[PDB]
PDB file of C-alpha atoms in Angstrom:
ATOM      1  CA  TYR A   1       1.060  -2.349 -33.718  1.00 40.08           C
ATOM      2  CA  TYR A   2       3.054  -1.115 -30.849  1.00 40.69           C
ATOM      3  CA  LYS A   3       0.784  -0.586 -27.972  1.00 39.50           C
ATOM      4  CA  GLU A   4       0.113  -4.217 -27.947  1.00 44.12           C
ATOM      5  CA  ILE A   5       3.702  -5.102 -28.032  1.00 43.82           C
ATOM      6  CA  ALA A   6       4.338  -2.781 -25.141  1.00 43.18           C
ATOM      7  CA  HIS A   7       1.589  -4.286 -23.083  1.00 47.84           C
ATOM      8  CA  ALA A   8       2.423  -7.857 -23.804  1.00 48.46           C
ATOM      9  CA  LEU A   9       5.978  -7.075 -22.807  1.00 47.47           C
ATOM     10  CA  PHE A  10       4.909  -5.540 -19.559  1.00 46.25           C
ATOM     11  CA  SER A  11       2.818  -8.554 -18.673  1.00 47.69           C
ATOM     12  CA  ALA A  12       5.634 -10.798 -19.720  1.00 50.04           C
ATOM     13  CA  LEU A  13       7.965  -9.023 -17.394  1.00 54.42           C
ATOM     14  CA  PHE A  14       5.638  -9.171 -14.452  1.00 52.65           C
ATOM     15  CA  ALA A  15       5.345 -12.869 -15.048  1.00 53.81           C
ATOM     16  CA  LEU A  16       9.048 -13.523 -15.406  1.00 54.33           C
ATOM     17  CA  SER A  17       9.799 -11.561 -12.276  1.00 54.93           C
ATOM     18  CA  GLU A  18       7.100 -13.423 -10.448  1.00 53.85           C
ATOM     19  CA  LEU A  19       8.724 -16.657 -11.500  1.00 55.30           C
ATOM     20  CA  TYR A  20      12.197 -15.620 -10.501  1.00 55.02           C
ATOM     21  CA  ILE A  21      11.079 -14.638  -7.062  1.00 54.88           C
ATOM     22  CA  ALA A  22       8.937 -17.745  -6.745  1.00 49.25           C
ATOM     23  CA  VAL A  23      12.189 -19.629  -7.080  1.00 44.30           C
ATOM     24  CA  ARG A  24      14.361 -17.439  -4.929  1.00 46.08           C
ATOM     25  CA  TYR A  25      11.969 -16.669  -2.124  1.00 43.30           C
TER      26      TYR A  25
ATOM     27  CA  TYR B   1       7.976 -23.350  -3.620  1.00 45.38           C
ATOM     28  CA  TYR B   2       6.592 -25.834  -6.169  1.00 46.34           C
ATOM     29  CA  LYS B   3       2.877 -25.206  -6.759  1.00 48.28           C
ATOM     30  CA  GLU B   4       4.007 -21.612  -6.958  1.00 49.42           C
ATOM     31  CA  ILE B   5       6.704 -22.176  -9.600  1.00 48.97           C
ATOM     32  CA  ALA B   6       4.160 -24.131 -11.622  1.00 48.30           C
ATOM     33  CA  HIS B   7       1.717 -21.207 -11.477  1.00 46.19           C
ATOM     34  CA  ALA B   8       4.461 -18.726 -12.404  1.00 48.16           C
ATOM     35  CA  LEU B   9       5.809 -21.044 -15.129  1.00 47.56           C
ATOM     36  CA  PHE B  10       2.357 -21.130 -16.714  1.00 46.23           C
ATOM     37  CA  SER B  11       1.979 -17.345 -16.309  1.00 46.97           C
ATOM     38  CA  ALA B  12       5.286 -16.592 -18.042  1.00 48.83           C
ATOM     39  CA  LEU B  13       4.493 -19.111 -20.788  1.00 52.92           C
ATOM     40  CA  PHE B  14       1.090 -17.636 -21.690  1.00 52.98           C
ATOM     41  CA  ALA B  15       2.411 -14.071 -21.389  1.00 53.64           C
ATOM     42  CA  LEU B  16       5.554 -14.653 -23.481  1.00 54.86           C
ATOM     43  CA  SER B  17       3.437 -16.409 -26.109  1.00 55.57           C
ATOM     44  CA  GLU B  18       1.049 -13.422 -26.159  1.00 55.88           C
ATOM     45  CA  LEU B  19       4.049 -11.120 -26.649  1.00 53.95           C
ATOM     46  CA  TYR B  20       5.511 -13.230 -29.471  1.00 56.25           C
ATOM     47  CA  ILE B  21       2.132 -13.420 -31.220  1.00 56.48           C
ATOM     48  CA  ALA B  22       1.551  -9.674 -30.808  1.00 55.59           C
ATOM     49  CA  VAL B  23       4.985  -8.890 -32.266  1.00 56.06           C
ATOM     50  CA  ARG B  24       4.731 -11.138 -35.344  1.00 59.54           C
ATOM     51  CA  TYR B  25       0.957 -11.199 -35.958  1.00 57.25           C
TER      52      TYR B  25
ATOM     53  CA  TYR C   1     -11.372 -11.239 -33.401  1.00 54.10           C
ATOM     54  CA  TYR C   2     -12.054 -14.124 -31.180  1.00 55.15           C
ATOM     55  CA  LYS C   3      -8.852 -15.828 -30.436  1.00 53.90           C
ATOM     56  CA  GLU C   4      -7.728 -12.769 -28.703  1.00 57.49           C
ATOM     57  CA  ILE C   5     -10.822 -12.508 -26.695  1.00 58.40           C
ATOM     58  CA  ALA C   6     -10.446 -16.103 -25.656  1.00 55.15           C
ATOM     59  CA  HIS C   7      -6.889 -15.617 -24.577  1.00 55.68           C
ATOM     60  CA  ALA C   8      -7.436 -12.407 -22.742  1.00 56.31           C
ATOM     61  CA  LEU C   9     -10.261 -14.108 -20.908  1.00 55.81           C
ATOM     62  CA  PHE C  10      -8.104 -17.014 -19.931  1.00 56.94           C
ATOM     63  CA  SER C  11      -5.431 -14.734 -18.554  1.00 55.61           C
ATOM     64  CA  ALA C  12      -8.067 -12.715 -16.814  1.00 56.38           C
ATOM     65  CA  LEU C  13      -9.366 -15.792 -15.128  1.00 58.44           C
ATOM     66  CA  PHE C  14      -5.988 -16.968 -13.988  1.00 57.93           C
ATOM     67  CA  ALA C  15      -5.463 -13.562 -12.490  1.00 57.78           C
ATOM     68  CA  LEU C  16      -8.810 -13.356 -10.753  1.00 56.83           C
ATOM     69  CA  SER C  17      -8.380 -16.808  -9.295  1.00 53.19           C
ATOM     70  CA  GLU C  18      -4.917 -15.907  -8.159  1.00 52.62           C
ATOM     71  CA  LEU C  19      -6.359 -12.904  -6.397  1.00 52.97           C
ATOM     72  CA  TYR C  20      -9.146 -14.805  -4.738  1.00 56.70           C
ATOM     73  CA  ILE C  21      -6.785 -17.354  -3.343  1.00 56.94           C
ATOM     74  CA  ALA C  22      -4.302 -14.676  -2.339  1.00 55.15           C
ATOM     75  CA  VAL C  23      -7.065 -13.409  -0.103  1.00 58.00           C
ATOM     76  CA  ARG C  24      -8.356 -16.705   1.160  1.00 58.19           C
ATOM     77  CA  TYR C  25      -5.113 -18.551   1.666  1.00 58.18           C
TER      78      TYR C  25
ATOM     79  CA  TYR D   1      -1.276 -11.673   2.552  1.00 60.03           C
ATOM     80  CA  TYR D   2      -0.815  -8.025   1.519  1.00 58.58           C
ATOM     81  CA  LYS D   3       2.131  -7.684  -0.880  1.00 60.21           C
ATOM     82  CA  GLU D   4       0.528 -10.682  -2.515  1.00 60.08           C
ATOM     83  CA  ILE D   5      -2.945  -9.142  -2.885  1.00 62.38           C
ATOM     84  CA  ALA D   6      -1.297  -6.055  -4.350  1.00 64.97           C
ATOM     85  CA  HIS D   7       0.514  -8.184  -6.941  1.00 62.30           C
ATOM     86  CA  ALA D   8      -2.680 -10.096  -7.765  1.00 62.56           C
ATOM     87  CA  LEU D   9      -4.743  -6.878  -7.815  1.00 61.51           C
ATOM     88  CA  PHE D  10      -2.366  -5.437 -10.406  1.00 61.77           C
ATOM     89  CA  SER D  11      -2.394  -8.713 -12.381  1.00 62.15           C
ATOM     90  CA  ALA D  12      -6.194  -8.843 -12.571  1.00 61.05           C
ATOM     91  CA  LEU D  13      -6.341  -5.142 -13.464  1.00 61.62           C
ATOM     92  CA  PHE D  14      -3.929  -5.368 -16.417  1.00 60.67           C
ATOM     93  CA  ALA D  15      -5.477  -8.646 -17.597  1.00 55.81           C
ATOM     94  CA  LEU D  16      -9.101  -7.458 -17.372  1.00 56.31           C
ATOM     95  CA  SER D  17      -8.128  -4.260 -19.187  1.00 53.67           C
ATOM     96  CA  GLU D  18      -6.459  -6.342 -21.927  1.00 58.03           C
ATOM     97  CA  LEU D  19      -9.664  -8.387 -22.231  1.00 55.47           C
ATOM     98  CA  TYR D  20     -11.899  -5.302 -22.415  1.00 53.44           C
ATOM     99  CA  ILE D  21      -9.645  -3.696 -25.031  1.00 51.87           C
ATOM    100  CA  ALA D  22      -9.481  -6.913 -27.071  1.00 49.40           C
ATOM    101  CA  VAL D  23     -13.281  -7.238 -27.026  1.00 48.71           C
ATOM    102  CA  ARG D  24     -14.088  -3.653 -28.069  1.00 49.55           C
ATOM    103  CA  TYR D  25     -11.004  -2.726 -30.128  1.00 49.43           C
TER     104      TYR D  25
END
């Protein structure tokens, strides 16, 4: 049950970060 | 700036949804 | 069993495409 | 060109792994 959560979170973070930067820079 | 933020918007949407789903299902 | 496959595939495709372009353009 | 292709490389790697995992597990 976790591993998946962990992963999904990772991916989610990469994506959010990517967005943020895509705005800023 | 724009095409980018669309791509990243999508990315974060799919990823966050995957996370949500993986946490509750 | 499928839905997940489907999703993962989608994401995979977005990523591959993103790569390809990141090379080409 | 480069930082980008690193980001996209990562993205495709994590995503493809998620797909693989979801198909066999």
